Ligand binder design. Structure first.
Ligand SMILES: Nc1ncnc2c1ncn2[C@@H]1O[C@H](COP(=O)(O)OP(=O)(O)OP(=O)(O)O)[C@@H](O)[C@H]1O
Ligand SMILES: [Mg+2]
Lengths: 327, 310, 213
């Protein structure tokens, strides 16, 4: 006879993700997808509106004590807080924190924290950093759609001090050309590249003919800041950044000691760094107001400042100011 | 071993019935079809359809579950690393209450199987919304195969040309996701196999042949499966079943599943009466009606004639 | 001698288990990324007054001591000067570090040494002798013994991931080194798990300290 006896018992595979495990686009590069664009992409992949998916799954995990079905028939602002809203949701705010935590738990993904700036909480001041209204680069969207590439909004577009796309040298457009209104970042249905109000198109060959060199340092520094966070491999330590700033201050002081003229070029930044090192270290520092000009005068990229260790940073500073020190 | 565990005699009747019901035997046709199906699954070779025919009771459902389980355990070592990676998906088609087959029900049931959240609410980013949701779910969840049991219910349409339009809709679902569709059904799938070049090229046909009484090798195989079923019957005494091989074949038509369910009925009847052996009248009590056997034989003969194209 | 330095930190906080190697190493790596990749670094056992439940109560002389090459201090000083770390749910604080030299002594001692695949005392002595020759060192090998005279084994619990692995080691006392070779021994050490808070060698008085209790 036949000795083979099959067994059809189930195998009990590990629990699957509640939502699709969509990869974030261009993580670690100056063109990383914003959390808002990722939310809209996940909603589009599920054939659900961002609002509807939000109260379907994120709201019960965010809003702890409510009836989930009764939450299914509300406005997005009840949990997002549209009184604030703004592209600042991409920042380091509390609702951003809990939203990122819930999203990472739902898809068991380990990179959504890089799609925002919670890794820089306590490091970079929130005020004066993010735009109040949605912005886009029409050339980017048109090129992406023509090349059959995924549409999304980079983090750089959410910053006030980023107004130009270095790829296309085009000033960011905050107003829909069709309806004339300015889109909020969060809406009931706002797929990337589309007008959240009139459903019109926002990608056109718009030419940028301004002095982009003025804002080049700011945009490149912010791009480096976004692109560097996923590559660190750890949560940054506040006093690490504080002591790097202090080391740059000491290098500045030694350079001034060697050359008196440099005091004229660096006095204001010296005073600002001294104040930032005398105030509480746990207090965040204003990114564009303090760190970017400081590393600019130090002739050091934001990537070099936040990435290199103390030895490399000290050696490069000494070489940059032609000092004879060796740490 | 050829014998059932000997401590099962002291156990209650329910335990013996359970041991018998979750026990299944591998006869040569079933294992051959299993190897062929898994070889096609591992290497689709550009074919998006693995249509599997067979008589009512050859073991189509059992083969489906076995393939699902084995592919699941083959994929298991890597599901810990990668999530949203359902290995295989197997659902059964629903006969429509209305005259025509319903596709909204098909799409929503497929979404239910994939644990799609907020299926009822949905939206259309442009049943088109349900179809797009199913396409996206198949693309992202990345299933290896897609079994659709009882594929004869697909052609519950009064239009002869829409009969292949059902498979046209399934095919349009398949291409934009590139997921293998291995449909299983009775001899009715035969009117769907190779209609049009699209379904004639990318479809691989597997026939779950039954055990016919003409070839002496098949008769010997049927006698051997009878012998192993007798030796695996959880009774105090082993009844002699190989002798009435003609009687067992008459009411089963060679379908191994029919033999299994008939023997399950007889064993349960014996256990309820606390009997120790199986009598001929015990088999006669729960035998299938002669008219029923005639009807299924006519159906499988017509199916074999249709599939006899060379 | 002075070519290598022992970084000392006045450590205060909750009482700590006596097999706290991986705990303190993981906490330090959490608050100091560069520590996770350095090579010639090692940590001295944390002194104090032990308790009845295999825990150590930190005292005024309790301090975290780190052995490091003087050409790598600027990679560790920023992340530990004044810094605080958590071991589980316990808070620990470090003061401004002070530098201590590597002094030679006639005899040395190690609290816990582990070499892979050596559990018996005799083969452990043979392997410590082999590493002893590999360093160009001369001396005699003795194993610290309990009150019973049995060689004393110490155990390190590495709680990697959900599981935890067991590594057992011995206390090794080596005498008659000659000061140059003594310094070489204290700086190299034996065992390799110096990041794991084992392989650092100390003058022989601490051997008496550990043998009394
Ligand atoms: N080779 C086999 N050995 C044991 N039991 C079998 C075997 N094949 C089928 N069965 C039994 O048959 C039942 C499953 O139904 P089966 O697959 O035989 O029907 P089918 O007509 O091919 O399928 P369906 O009607 O779902 O299309 C179960 O009770 C199972 O134990
Ligand atoms: Mg069946």
């Amino acid at each position: 006879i036949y000795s083979e006896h099959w067994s059809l018992n189930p195998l009990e595979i590990p629990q699957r993700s509640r939502l699709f495990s969509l990869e974030p686009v261009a993580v670690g590069t100056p063109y990383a997808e914003s959390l808002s664009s990722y939310l809209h992409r996940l909603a589009q992949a599920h054939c659900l509106t961002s609002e509807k998916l939000v109260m379907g799954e994120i709201a019960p995990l965010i809003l702890k004590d409510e009836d989930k079905s009764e939450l299914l028939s509300k406005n997005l602002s009840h949990l997002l807080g549209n009184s604030d809203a703004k592209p600042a949701i991409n920042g380091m705010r509390e609702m951003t924190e809990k939203l990122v935590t819930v999203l990472e738990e739902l898809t068991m993904r380990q990179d959504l924290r890089f799609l925002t700036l919670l890794s820089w909480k306590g490091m970079i001041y929130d005020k004066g950093l993010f735009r109040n209204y949605r912005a886009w680069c029409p050339c980017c969207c048109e090129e992406w759609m023509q090349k059959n590439k995924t549409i999304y909004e980079p983090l750089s577009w959410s910053f006030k001090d980023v107004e130009f796309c270095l790829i296309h040298k085009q000033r960011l457009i905050e107003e829909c050309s069709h309806c004339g209104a300015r889109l909020p970042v969060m809406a009931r249905l706002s797929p990337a590249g589309f007008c959240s109000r009139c459903y019109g198109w926002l990608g056109q060959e718009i030419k940028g003919e301004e002095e982009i060199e003025k804002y080049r340092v700011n945009i490149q520094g912010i791009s480096e800041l976004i692109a560097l966070t996923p590559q660190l491999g750890y949560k940054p330590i506040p006093i690490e950044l504080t002591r790097k700033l202090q080391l740059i201050l000491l290098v500045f002081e030694q350079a001034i000691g060697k050359d008196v003229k440099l005091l004229g070029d660096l006095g204001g930044i010296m005073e600002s760094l001294r104040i930032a090192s005398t105030t509480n270290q746990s207090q965040p520092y204003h990114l564009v107001k303090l760190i970017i000009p400081v590393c600019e005068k130090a002739k050091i990229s934001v990537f070099q400042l936040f990435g290199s260790d103390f030895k490399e940073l000290g050696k490069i500073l000494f070489g940059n100011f032609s000092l004879e020190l060796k740490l | 071993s050829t014998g059932f565990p000997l401590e099962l005699l002291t156990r209650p009747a329910t335990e013996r019935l359970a041991y018998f019901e979750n026990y299944t035997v591998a006869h040569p046709r079933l294992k051959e079809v299993y190897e062929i199906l898994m070889r096609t699954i591992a290497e689709p070779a550009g074919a998006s359809f693995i249509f599997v025919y067979g008589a009512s009771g050859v073991g189509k459902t059992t083969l489906r579950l076995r393939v699902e389980q084995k592919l699941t355990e083959l994929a298991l070592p890597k599901l810990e690393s990668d999530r949203a990676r359902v290995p295989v998906v197997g659902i059964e088609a629903i006969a429509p209450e209305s005259r025509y087959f319903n596709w909204k029900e098909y799409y929503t049931r497929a979404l239910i199987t994939l644990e799609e959240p907020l299926i009822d609410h949905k939206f259309d980013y442009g049943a088109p919304a349900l179809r797009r949701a199913l396409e996206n779910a198949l693309i992202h969840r990345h299933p290896d195969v897609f079994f659709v049991d009882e594929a004869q219910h697909f052609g519950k349409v009064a239009s002869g040309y829409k009969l292949q339009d059902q498979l046209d809709c399934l095919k349009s679902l398949a291409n934009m996701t590139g997921i293998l569709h291995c449909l299983l059904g009775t001899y009715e799938l035969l009117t769907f196999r190779n209609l049009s070049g699209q379904l004639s090229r990318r479809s691989v046909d597997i026939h779950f042949r039954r055990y016919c009484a003409d070839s002496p090798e098949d008769v010997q195989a049927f006698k051997s499966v009878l012998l192993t079923f007798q030796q695996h019957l959880p009774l105090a005494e082993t009844p002699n079943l190989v002798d009435h091989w003609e009687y067992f074949y008459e009411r089963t038509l060679g379908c191994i599943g029919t033999l299994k369910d008939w023997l399950k009925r007889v064993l349960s009847d014996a256990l309820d009466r606390e009997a120790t052996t199986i009598t001929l009248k015990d088999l006669q009590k729960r035998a299938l009606s002669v008219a029923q056997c005639q009807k299924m034989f006519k159906e499988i003969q017509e199916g074999e004639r249709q599939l006899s194209e060379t | 001698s002075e070519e290598y330095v022992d970084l000392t930190f006045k450590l205060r906080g909750a009482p700590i288990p006596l097999d706290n190697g991986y705990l303190t190493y993981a906490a330090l790596s959490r608050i100091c990324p560069p520590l996770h990749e350095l090579k010639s670094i090692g940590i001295h056992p944390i002194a104090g007054i032990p308790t009845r439940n295999n825990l150590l109560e930190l005292t005024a002389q309790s301090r975290l001591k780190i052995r490091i090459y003087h050409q790598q201090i600027p990679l560790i000083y920023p992340y530990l000067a004044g810094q605080a770390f958590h071991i589980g749910q316990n808070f620990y604080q470090l003061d401004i570090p002070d530098y201590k030299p590597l002094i030679s002594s006639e005899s040395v001692y190690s609290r816990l040494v582990i070499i892979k695949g050596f559990q018996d005392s005799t083969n452990f002595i043979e392997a410590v002798q082999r590493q002893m020759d590999n360093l160009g060192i001369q001396g005699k090998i003795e194993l610290l013994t309990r009150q019973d005279g049995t060689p004393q084994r110490r155990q390190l619990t590495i709680n990697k991931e959900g599981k935890q692995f067991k590594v057992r080691g011995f206390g090794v006392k080596i005498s008659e080194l000659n000061p140059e070779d003594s310094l070489t021994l204290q700086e190299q050490g034996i065992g390799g798990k110096r990041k794991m808070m084992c392989g650092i060698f100390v003058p022989a008085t601490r051997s008496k300290e550990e043998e009394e209790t």
